[PDB]
């Protein structure tokens, strides 16, 4: 089983093995404790190993929802957090300062811990930290970090959504507008979610369902099928043309592309005020 | 303000303007009734335009989760689940048949409304569907779909993990072990979200942290700066060089790369033995 440490607004999980000084493992981007079972096998005869989920990550648990300012590219407050949590899970354990070793970002939650609690640091190791705060061209890689997380967020949406446009035959316009970014960080990522949710739940499980043309001849009367006029050849328009040639149901030109609702929305309203009104 | 129904497993929220005979519009891939609203204005005066939002996204929200199978790609709840909510909709609203227009996959959604509950169709339309379950070569873009989806779960993790590596400079195999995909459907979006948590609330926050060269110089004594010995060249370890440089702290050198813990876990266990035990 994993362990439980219960502290302001997280339950705080790590693993714990071996004997004798307590060594805690701080984990980098990965964030969970488990990159260092392997490197604790060695150490269990001569350390009481600590290998932490940090609170975000892994089987620790959030019970308060992280602050709305912790979006901010210059929030402290996570980092700040972490080492807390590391500080209350040392006095927890041992009664003498313990032993800390922490790799990339987690090095850098060492960092906060001398700093702010070195009262329970006997020795702490730093690994290849990638902090750049105090080096003479911060600047230079502060403004590399933050380009390629601006970077990231925006292309990643339009990747996904042209491979597929491309296989389906879709107009340009048409996957442009579908994956457009939106105007704000929480909402491109807001967008970002909704991406893979699609993916993963819709995608593959709506194009497969269980439809066949008795769907389509039942009550073929009430169904109109809709084209766009801007988008031909891709390849929901060839599903339109197959319906219609083995059911009768009529295809209506509707002006726009696959966006058209959206694209022209007068001439969208005229052809259904035409169909319908 | 936005209208809500409360169904089975979901608060169901809906945009509703006009008057006259009621005309729902079911939104594809990006599952919001918003789209449909400039389409709405033009029709407002001969409908009651009703523009949902689909019980997963948007203001909607599930009251209950979705159950564990609907990650199959062969799962039919889902759409099912979301004609059902339309002819629900359409009952609370009208007690004579209603106009219905789907597109993309709102019109798959529409496609199961007319074969479940054909009572509350009067008119229906299916906008540029992309379901391919009845056509001659079904299966070759069936086939066509999940090779995409796969892609997208695999590429997006190494992707953004590459501009990254290539920019701090780190070994290709350390980038490789970093974005390495889970073995496991639920495991690559897992490690999905993870890394998207990353990139928005720690890289930028930690890597620009608060840290200055009196945080190293304080207790100084007490630290130790490791460098793995395959990933020479790397931001990280430059890093170490100005601390190393400034202060004083000795450098010691650590088996394995970037992740060299679990890279080498017996060499980093002896240099850490030989340093604390």
New interface residues.
């Given amino acids: 089983g994993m362990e439980t440490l219960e502290l302001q607004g997280a339950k705080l999980r790590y693993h714990q093995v071996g004997q004798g000084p307590v ?1 805690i ?1 701080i984990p980098g ?3 969970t404790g488990d ?2 079972l ?2 604790a ?3 269990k005869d ?2 009481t190993v600590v290998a932490v989920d940090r609170r ?2 892994g089987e620790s648990e959030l019970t308060e929802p ?1 602050p709305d300012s ?7 407050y ?2 700040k957090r972490d080492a807390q949590d590391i500080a209350e899970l040392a006095k927890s354990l041992s009664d003498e300062p313990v ?1 800390i ?1 922490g ?3 987690g090095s ?2 060492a ?2 811990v ?2 702010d609690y ?1 009262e329970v ?15 003479p061209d ?1 600047t230079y ?2 403004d ?3 380009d ?2 601006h ?3 925006t292309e ?1 949406l339009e ?2 959504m042209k ?2 446009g491309e ?2 035959n879709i107009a340009p316009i048409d996957a442009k507008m ?1 994956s457009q970014p939106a105007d704000t ?1 929480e909402g491109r ?1 807001e967008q ?1 979610k ?1 991406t ?18 008795d ?1 389509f001849t ?2 073929s009367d ?7 006029t801007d ?1 031909r050849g ?4 060839d ?2 043309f ?2 219609n040639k083995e059911t009768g149901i009529p295809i209506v030109d ?1 002006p726009g592309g ?5 694209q022209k ?2 001439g ?3 052809v ?2 035409n ?3």
Same sequence: chains 1, 2.
Avoid: C
């Fill in positions: 060594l493992f981007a990965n964030g990159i260092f392997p490197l096998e060695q150490l001569h350390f975000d990550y992280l912790a979006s901010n590219p210059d929030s402290d996570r980092v032993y070793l790799s990339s970002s850098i939650v960092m906060h001398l700093k070195p640091v006997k020795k702490i190791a730093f690994h290849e930290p990638p902090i750049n705060t105090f080096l911060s890689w502060k590399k970090n933050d390629i997380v970077q990231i967020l990643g990747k996904g491979t597929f296989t389906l579908m960080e990522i970002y909704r893979m949710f699609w993916l993963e739940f819709e995608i593959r499980q709506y194009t497969h369902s269980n439809i066949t043309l769907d039942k009550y009430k169904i109109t099928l809709l084209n766009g988008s891709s390849f929901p328009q599903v339109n197959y319906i509707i696959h966006l058209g609702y959206i929305p007068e969208f309203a005229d259904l005020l169909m319908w009104g």
